[PDB]
Amino acid sequence: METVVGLTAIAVALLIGLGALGTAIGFGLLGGKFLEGAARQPEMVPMLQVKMFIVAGLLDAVTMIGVGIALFFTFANPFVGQI
Template sequence: MTNVAFVALACGLIIGLGAIGACIGIGLMGGKYLEASARQPELMNVLQTKMFLLAGLIDAAFLIGVGIAMLFAFSNPFVG
């Protein structure tokens, strides 16, 4: 396999594993939010604000991985 093939494989892994991690993280966080708001409904607004903040941070980490993968895909430093 050539270096271009390895870069394409690495880009796919970066995006795929990042998406899986972000989906699992947001799913677990949403479940815990529902459990916490069912136990103490008076804290629902405070918990919702924190949940959306963390969802944005989790999604930002995934999008940084997509940006790095696109950097390798379109301006590949390994092509000589």
């Protein structure tokens, strides 16, 4: 059991760590364009803010699946039951 349990900690760190890395860079790109449009046309902000949340759902979709699988591998373990 020792190496399967030790390698499950690294598997969880890669799932949450790569997800945290991508989501921070992704929102930095999407966010900068929201502020740029908002500064040029301050009347458009109500529309642009709603359109940003439609993209934010697509951007985090696979990252949240990764965090869901990482919590499952932490509080339960599908590999330990396979010896």
